[model samples]
Target chain A: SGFRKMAFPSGKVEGCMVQVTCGTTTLNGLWLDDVVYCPRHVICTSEDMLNPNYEDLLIRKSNHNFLVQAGNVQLRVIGHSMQNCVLKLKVDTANPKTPKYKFVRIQPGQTFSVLACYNGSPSGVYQCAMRPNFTIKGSFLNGSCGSVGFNIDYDCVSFCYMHHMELPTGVHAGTDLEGNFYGPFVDRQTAQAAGTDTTITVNVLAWLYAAVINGDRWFLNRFTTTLNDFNLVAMKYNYEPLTQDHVDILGPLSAQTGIAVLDMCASLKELLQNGMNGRTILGSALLEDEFTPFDVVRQCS
Target chain B: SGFRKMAFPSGKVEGCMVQVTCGTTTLNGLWLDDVVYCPRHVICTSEDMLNPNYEDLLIRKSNHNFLVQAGNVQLRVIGHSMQNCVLKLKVDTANPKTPKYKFVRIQPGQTFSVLACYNGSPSGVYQCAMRPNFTIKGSFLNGSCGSVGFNIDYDCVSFCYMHHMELPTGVHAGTDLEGNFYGPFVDRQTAQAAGTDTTITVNVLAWLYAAVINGDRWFLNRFTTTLNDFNLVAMKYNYEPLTQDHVDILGPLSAQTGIAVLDMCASLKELLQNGMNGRTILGSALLEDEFTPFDVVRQCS
Candidate 1:
């Protein structure tokens, strides 16, 4: 629903005119080939378009000239441009002066591994810009030749987020609505190669559920709400719900545990059965422990 | 009371004949001069005594060939022997294999500073031995030709026991029997040259009495027994009891502070009032906190 609307000149009027808006700014240009296409966005009217006679206007047509793959502490930059380009990478910050820039030289159709992006900020958002010389020839003249922005989910291992479950593989396999594939990953190299934006989900719920099964009150008291919220979000995204088999694995362990464990387990089970979303689950979970999720999780975990 | 007994042969013995035991095996030797003399104990029967005709019968009369001064974490080895000797030093331990040995070379009437003797073990008990070749000639072969043992009080400042206290040159003066001398300690060279161990004795008992005067129940509850014992021991060692002036100084402070400060003040005061000997003072002091006296005093003071 949030995808950009693309329009072609009405009835093939003239020399390739296209207009693109990012909900905020409208960019107009002639010779559509001069516009640089970016993943999820486009850059129109750049310096290259000043040469009106620039005939080699037909560049790659896909909106995405590059792909970004984020990992626990780094970002992998892949270059899909038709020619070599020098790219500037930066972690997104409010103060532009404080942002450290990493320059990467990439040959056409290559990848550069940018390490330590997650060192300072907890937000895990990043922006990258390709050199104007290597971008599409266009007129509107934006500062960055072709630019892309992305946000890492910043899941449980770093910060708690709803989509923290591992993607199921084989028969249970399904990609999320965003077309990002997920799997029970064994290592980063294999996981990164399998799909785009797949590194964020670490199956934190399964481990948390296992902790509850073991009747670890310390672990449950801290992680239960997070697990419940994650479960609710996963279900909304058409994720398979936790099965009877999952409870069966955990049920016997909780049977002999204290009332606190039993109550939390019961509440989680009820929420999953009722097909509730994260907000409702969080509301119910808060009743059990009237504490900030982070506070409770940090103290107990 | 634990000092060793010494005896000369009963009659005019031919050549030199002696027998020595270290609470264990007896060793026989002749030619008294060839037998080594050690301090606080002796290792007189050595290899050279095997040859009966070996004369030079009169070795130095004194059993002590060296004296050891220990301070902080260091040992000063003072050679009193008539000849140069290689001395081996080690902290005492139940297991021989684990003992680390420090070696020092000392000439007659010289002092060798054995730095960091208490580097690892804060206990500060050390045993020193003279090499056989540089020792009195003898037979019956013991591992070391002569051996001696000593303990450092682990004083706060320096090696000299009484000099360990801070010397008062001007106004403030106080000596904690815990052997922490507090005052304006002038240079060691000047202070040692000027006076003996005449440093300020903290009026500890008066301080304790002052706590009682201030009615600190918590202070009375915890340290009453220890204070009583310390006072009793202090009297046995002829230390002066608390005076009115001492109480006057601490009375105002104890009246306002909490029980902890009052209790510590009371305990230290009572210990001083009873005139405890250093050994008993050390023994009881060791029992209260089990922390180094320096740690306790540093915190309270």
Candidate 2:
């Protein structure tokens, strides 16, 4: 401990706001708190280093026979892990009053799963916030379907230890045995690689017709599946970048399609019955510890 | 400036916190000005006194021929002492956005009359803002003919001479007429005398449904006419000691009853389509320095 002087010619620190933290040599290295600032700040402190990266996490690793019908239902979720990791699940209900969100915790690198179901009614945007430092993201899928689905929010990496990494983007896949269409796998890596850090927030427009669709049971399942797919993609990218496309998707894929013009009369009746007429709905969600690669930097220290 | 020794009373000061004024006094049985108060050390100022006994100043003279009618259209306005008093007219069917208000000023004691052929499409509220304070008042005479006519935002009075005067209570009849069913004078005096200020505020419900026999229209007319009579009485008393029976005497008598309902409704529709809605109403007459009784008091000094 007397005067062991070791000098390096040069060194560099990286990250959004990387600081060379110094502590006694008794410790291997100081824990650096990474705070990524964008339109919203993404902070990762020393305590978060212990958090498990959710990459490679799966809903069903061995079982392949999960399938959902195209109607109303509820989904139940269950899982575990070595690190206390939160698995957030959301659905695109179009309306904000009944926002879909569920949290699941798991230990480090451990198997985590949860079963949750919703009626195939409203379908707009859905997403999740896997970690506290991770921002909640996602949108609603348009196509109607029912089946087992897989979606990803993110993955992380480590230098020395076997870093249980989460993928860079969110992804999901669903199947509909009835429509003869199988596997609605959603992936965000390709888009995230091309997107900028300045883009993340998603603006989802909710329509009144969804108020009518959500009232029926038969439409709930498919609506939920589509919403799950949408959230898987929306979480990684800004939806505003795809506004025209979203409108196009909504025009044809909306539940209003095929419904008689006079059908609004029935909807109006139901709306009046439910006292929904002349009423406005407001909805919002906050993601805990959400982040993106565009927000972080890497340098040899 | 009088040489007479003047003694100012301790309680004669008016206004609070800002500027206190000494109330005017009568010396030698004549209203005095420049009277100095010794206790408060304030000089007496001139104040506008509208009427001395309040009864003889602005007289409310009635007439039998004041009933002006045309087919189902009729109008009568009470509470005279009006110079350049005019009837503002409009027609509902004639370009609703830009109808017309024809001001027909009547002589001090002449009948204010107009008649409209029944075309039957005119509907909505007819507004009337009387001068002397430009008090904005209106009536819901057409459509369902609700008795609850006239909704004057009390705030508007703050801009007028009536700013210090409490808001007027309700609508009242202006004339006495004879008809198949409706007739003679309606009195608001009985109601005010009965200790009920029924003329204070009237709430217009449906217009047409309230008309007819025992309908909202008939009630409105009865209420308004009686209210007008009560106001005349109020003017006599400087708006002090108003009662229900006193206000009730303003109700229309048998001669003024038959055509009052239909005429008021038609006139109302015309007004809504054109008159007050167009913001062409005149300013207050009695409140003007040239017309107010207070001017006479000042002249005496």
Candidate 3:
């Protein structure tokens, strides 16, 4: 059959002495039952004369973009390739939390400004159903005109403290986008529920930033109408709330690293109120079957 | 000699079916000849009941900070520890290109201000020697006084376009700091020179940011004197030159992520012209023997 091989700086999964694999002649890109994390430099590649590549793969982070090419020289990919395919890339893992974001277009032509906001917001009430409560008066809802879009983060913080997350990396970006962004995406909380829910959640939440980016949508939204669209990918990032340490250290770093310079957090928050373009995160996997696109849930939040 | 072990998401270096190792009973924390890259989540922990941990380990990114706890899930370290000791953690891989940066302090009651610039500039010339031509007048070299320091970047851009960089991650931040910040720190470029020098550089520099941060140092400088200093480790980061795309995308991301809000680059630049506290990069390695700290080179341009 086909196989999806993973190697550390060391070598392959086999080299790691992994005993079992669900490799079959016709499938590749993932491990269903025994999915795990590769803590070091992970070189993921699949070749299945039998195994095929993934149609839709999702990757999540600590709300950080979970897996992508990390900056290691020697371990760097020599020549990433494909069988001459038009692969796309999108990056939106700005905030570790509210990854449950959706985009709504606001085109030109004299439509009522409130209409865009109305269409943008679900106006529904519920946890993770973050919309109606957004500060709209400043936006098109109140009237900021632009042929952009509104991004909504379905952060459950509106009701419950819990959003989702189980594992890391290898998040299979299922279509419904109903999966958690912190841990496993496609796979729901497997082991945690039955017996170790609290016990397991305790340790993980500590290490992981159980935060979300709500209402942290880009003030600017422009999806190209040209062929460049095919050459492009989307990535979204809200904000990684800076710790005092982060503010003191990275705050300066990010600020100074700039071509010009400025107060970051304050400036950034101001921009968030205006416009933002987050081309963002999640996956590379081949599951038993590709996910079905979830129907657009129009229930107003 | 105790051995060092590495595993893929699969298992240990052994699990990788790695055959040879220089495991000794006295020390560990490194892999000499068999050393390589782990392209996934790296769970680096060592015990030297027979083998100890690292004395100096350097990790480099493609100009990004290498080998740190990447933002991954399951593979996260739950309880990072040591022998009930206060381990240090300093980060400064700000500019992948010019990590050859250093700090100098400017306390109160300073005599002639030029003295600080004199102390700061090696004024050294030569590829990677990067100094001499730095803009000083505006800084302590001229006036802007406060309890701060001037940072320098020994980027080869002044002469040779080539600074250094061979492998990735696992850079052994040796004391000399002569080691490249993008590849193997302690180890010189192996396998490339005797034969494949150009051959290898091509592949690597492409993927890896062959850049370095020269004078793009922090405007602020303060290393606390209280007990909290012990709780801190220095991390340095200059700036990552944003591309048009980065400017278009991440420029917005970083800007919006800010508080109060402001033109980040311009603002950061203003701040850089004033003060910046960059506690920054490089280290963790237990080699065949500990490295002798390189003598400070006081050669001025």
Candidate 4:
């Protein structure tokens, strides 16, 4: 059995909206004119006592505790906690060891200024968590926390990521390493059907040069290592070993460096030879079934 | 009365053409079949004696004294003179101090191997001359020279010239400092009208950056001086002074450098500001009536 009480504290009770919710059961109605009504057999349990102060219980609904806004080169975090807490931000959750933590003593109903989480890089998902140690009344709590997650896009982030991964930035189609050239294709399956071993080699080189110019040190180190390995395999199988002399003759390829000094004809030759060999190496790592012409075109683009 | 003898030395003289002329006056006929004809009272005077050996007198018509062929990086000179001669090739007639002279004592009807006039640079009109110094009877004649001119267009020569002159390598419609930005006209009046002060400054900078990466010290010094002069005029007015800081921030524009770390937006900003200011300075030097809104759009592109 449950009992309920309804009363108008001030003004006309009629047309005054009221809502009552108990144990997932909710009722909505306007108060009767100048009326005080009391119903018996209301079940008021320990759950009601737990949240005795409805105002305090509902305050969290109005307070947005944690926020994140990404800028051109920085991530901005705002702590709007009503209680003092420590805020933790994690970027790229796939790697668990790298989380940025900040001790923020935000007052009740106050918002902290935007704090930078990371410097400029590519776009990615970020996770935010606030651990409140104490309530506004100075009452200590063992564990009180809230969390939020968001995605951000920084300028050139996509370009940087693609460059780092040795992937092509856009659509391209041309001759393959096996001496078979094909027309351009927008679809991976179609390209695969039309592609050859030569296409794989040429495609890789095309992206490789672009990446070399724009990639970071990490990308460069990885790419160069892979390229050298490919050269070794190529030399073992009758292809000439790729050499720095070849790169030198190809001319400078750096963002700081302007256009390459090598003529178009020379560049094409370098791309066809070295670029193709590198692609073959990349393809060797994948399952033969997976290494389709479509994969080369798609990955290069 | 004077007498003249006509003789045929070969096969049949029938239908053989014969001509006798004196100071633009002429007579022509064919000898009768296999006949040696002699005409009495043929009016043979001092004019006839002047060309007594008419067959040998115009042998030069078949002997080309000088022939010039321009190659990729060198000039081919053929001295087909019956007598010995020296070949001289002058590249870029604008310079008179230096000439490529070769003591090529070519025999009659022989082609010389390609002679290198200039090692590198664009193709243009080159003047060639052959001076024949004869030892026939041991007589030396001065000023006995034949001259001819030819043009060439190597793969890189046109590009080199256009780049040096700060002209767009491909299709472009922009303001010119001389007011001859539009093509189909190469004269000075059209050039002057099409040119603007801003065009000169922008053009110089465009070429300066390119030359810095490709040209030698001679080119650098001359180009820098011209750029500084334009900057002085710009500074004389209300425009901001151009500084190396601007260039530094713009990132590596040289082959010697690596990646340009500046963001794309920042690069665009610097380019637009510097490029526009340069244009305005050029416009100030001209009549207000000459500097129009069209000029800005025309010059920037």
Candidate 5:
């Protein structure tokens, strides 16, 4: 059941190219060579996709829609009713604060929240959007975006899937997994690494779930969440392998990530429910333990 | 230990007045008399007090800040560089949509995420402007606000506490607890209700925590979050009561409120940790079983 449902084929990849193939998202800022290539999936989709520099992520003068830091997985916010969903990377040089991003162009007096996750790709399911034309990234009422409506859930939340930890990072982190590649591999490793890589099981998805729970960008964008988000979820499951005693110890850690310990527990239970040994959301994808952001890892065995 | 420590004198209450004493928030729209009175804690603290009608929430001409909807607790967002934190209720008639709120004003090209919580009160601890001044609510550089800098754990999070469910709503909800009253009453009732108010225990803070976890305004401003955010959280705690079978059942519910099941579990654990039978957060405040937003409930028992 693991790799059986992937919409990709395995292969070697680099940059945002094979990101989807490996199941990671271009939604987060991809850090390669320390430069931090960003806004990949923000304003437009992967159709007219190009390897972006910091400038490519900049907001245009009169642009209405943007996907600044759409960091949370299932969140979708709009500034204007006419625009499907626009997020912008608020890069201001004069006042320099943390490199934070924001969604924009509220229809004056209108209200909108800047989602943490840029996964809310406006250009959903319409392949013809790939038909090009530099001037036509339209609004909700009209426009041909790269992928028009890929999810049926609507209301702004994206249909999600959990990825394996084996997907390598760096340049290979860019692989786009549209239909090209993204398959299965060492799905049974968590149990093999140490005492059941309870570490990764409790972790890999810990950050993802934390964001879902409301960890702010300050926390999400930092390295702390990944450092300890599910630190104790693993201990809990493995030891009793596990609360005021269990919870007491993890309490401080829980507060840090915003996932809260209970949310951590769900991450574990979700994987087990689907008979998976790692973090997953039902059968959204047959996650494989692939490296190289594709099947390059599979090439070994 | 619960009510032993409180920053309030509780009493009968109704609207946004005793909101703090009762442990709820004026941040979310207070519904009394069937009409949603809002943006209370958004622009100014309850200093220059006057009951507000809808227009009171409208953005003032050239106001650089606003708090549209700060739904999540412990979250803070800033729009401009000098503003401590300005959230606008964002009541725009031109672009009609759901009742939503947002923090505003970017330095032209800069970016900022509108915090879902208006709790980031620009006015914190220092109070003297209480000295009769209708002219100043200054920027970080100037002026006097209602409550200047409430919490010590800055950047943008507030020190918080939980309250009982007995605080009655309506006209009486307006009792102020600044230095007046807000104590405890029913801390020991949850475990007593029905199998202990498993219903209230889990439900009370379920929605609260759900918002913390990333439940947006759409779900948060609605009642659905209140319905199942913790529906199964209680079930899981009770029957030893808990996976695939249990998880499969609650999985669907988790997705609905944005609070995954594990978050529900943490809510339970958090309650238990502080020896709280309900949703008491650390020793932030001494909660009580009070009836009014202030101390009216105490008058009864």
Candidate 6:
């Protein structure tokens, strides 16, 4: 009836490094949650990893190819959503004057091989942009059964239980049936100081969305699922937030290695949709923040 | 009932001092019929007078401005139809990628003006592509009573005359009948062996016509004149030849110097329209003939 608990060891260092350990319990195959490093410590080990640079990042090259590097310089999502997609890379030296990378769309869930190179340069912020189309049809769910799964629904519970007992965990804990168990702190103060780091994360999300929408395409589906309702209905859309304005602001800032507030907002939305509080999500390495090039050069030692 | 008799001089060194003398009697004050040296010679002398070591025949700085040595150039027109016409001058650098000298259009009575830097090294091949235009509407009938004005009709006459004449006196004679009558030499055969002494003079007229038609804005008038009419009607409104076939043939050849059969053919079409003999018009000056910057340079020297 409550949320599951996960754990991750945290440490700090001057430069980039990687470490891993196996635990007694594995939740959906342990993977590092998104986290941002200092601009100067840019440890984008991923050749083309999403969240590599830790901004709500979407980067599509001219060929429409999607790429995202990881902290270990591993090619994470080279052709993650491609199916018989012919990749085309064209560099336009006009308008956006810089070379634009792209690749054709691939089918959802299909994997494609990617060739990449890392010429011994220190890491920097990165982004992964993609356009994938997939079908989503949510069906009805009944009480616990082989065919139907039950969702924790305690709307009919009394106000006390409704507010406290039926409430999600990680906010605050209390003793009842079992012995007292100390959990991670999740109060307004902790959330505000560490978790609700809204400014930069929001900016990242905004910029990522802008990079997608402004680039001559439309979102095929925009739907939000709730714990109670499982139907996946596409929302009618106008630009909820005019992404162009955000892009103009974020592009320059991103170029300078400063954290994009708009891009962070996007990542925050994703975390919330997945029922993760900001601090726990970010601390668990489920979200990342990115600093701009200038900030990296300016702030880094 | 026969063609008017005329004479041309011969045996002038390639870089020798030369002058043009008025030959036939004219009804008007024949101030323009002076025995003028080639334009290249004039331009080169003018440029050298200001600065030393000038090499290029013409130099273009920006779109609307250019410099040329004054005396290192000359122009003459053939055909009785050339009477009462000033020369037009134009310099088309449209394809900054690769420019070609084209005889754009001519107006009646368009005189030519040369741009010589008071003191600078001349290097470019200054095209004296002269066409009769606003300045040379009609031959000076007197100081006053000029001939009936024309437009690109002068282009046709100049093209035909240059094609047939091959020698300079004929081009000059074509422009001013009195210049033709004046004895520079006995006949065409005598003039041909002497390094075609009259070639410079003929080229000057051809260049003047080309410059007037293609260079000067005077011929760009939207009025009903021979130049504008040819531009609109005869040329099918194509200031520059379009069509792939035309470009395929004329484009590369236009960049190079020399008279080719195709250029002669094109010039012949225009010339014949102006009542000149097509067969006698040897396609020399306008087509395959790649005019060298050195040719103009030699004239200046």
Error of 1 at A23 (Å): 43
In model 6, state the lDDT of residue A237: 16
**Model 1 lDDT per residue over A116-217, tens place:** 011111111111111111121111112111221111111101110001111122111211112122243221112222232211111223223333432332
**How many angstroms is residue A192 displaced in model 6 relative to the true structure, after the best TM-score fit?**
55
TM-score of chain A of each: 0.22, 0.19, 0.20, 0.17, 0.19, 0.16
Off by over 4 Å in 5: A1-180, A185-301, B1-301
lDDT of 3 by residue, A1-301 (tens): 0010111111111111111111111111111112211211111123421222333221211212222321110111112211111111123222122223232321111011111111111110111111111111111111111111122223211111111111222111111111112222222323321111111111111111100111112221232122122112111222222334322323222332331112223233333343322221011110101110110111100
Docking class for model 4 is incorrect
Question: Cα deviation in Å at residue B39, candidate 2?
Answer: 89
The lDDT values for all models are 0.24, 0.20, 0.18, 0.21, 0.23, 0.21
Cα error of candidate 5 at position B36, Å = 9.5
Per-prediction TM-score, please?
A: 0.17, 0.14, 0.18, 0.16, 0.21, 0.13
- Write the residue-wise lDDT of candidate 5 on A1-301 in tens digits: 0111111100000111101110122343321121222322333334333333323433332322332232232212222111112122222222111122221211111111111112322211110010011011111111111121111111222211111112221000011112111122222212222112222232224333332332112212212222243444345544123323444545544665555555555544444334332223321222211111111111111
Every candidate's chain B TM-score:
0.21, 0.16, 0.20, 0.17, 0.18, 0.17
Query: Relative to the unseen true structure, what is the Cα RMSD of model 2?
Result: 35.1
Q: What share of the true interface contacts does candidate 6 keep?
A: 0.00
**Error at A286, model 6, angstroms:** 61
What TM-score does structure 4 among the candidates reach?
A: 0.16
Question: Could you give candidate 2's fraction of true interface contacts?
Answer: 0.00
Better of 1 and 3 by DockQ: 3
Model 3 over residues B31-148: C-alpha lDDT tens digits? 1122221211112223422222333321321212222321111111112222111111223322122222232322111111111101111111100111111111111111111111
lDDT of 3 at A229: 24
Per-residue lDDT tens digits of candidate 4, residues B1-301? Answer: 0000101011111112232222232222111222111111011234443323333433422213221222112222222121111112222212221122212232211111110111121111111111111101000011101111111111111000000011221111211111222223221112222222222222223323332232212222211233354455545542334455544533334323231312222222343334332122211211111111212221222
lDDT of 1: 0.24
Cα lDDT tens digits, model 5, B123-234, are: 1111001001111111121111122111111122221111112222100001111111112222121222111221223222333343333212221221222224444544
RMSD of each: 30.7, 35.1, 26.2, 36.3, 22.1, 34.0
lDDT of 6 by residue, A1-301 (tens): 0011100000101011221111111000001122211111121233432223322121322122322222334323212111111111112211111112121232222111110002111111111111021211111011100010001111110000000010121122211111111122211112311121122332334333332322211221234333112211101111123234434645654444343443334333444355232223211223222322222221121
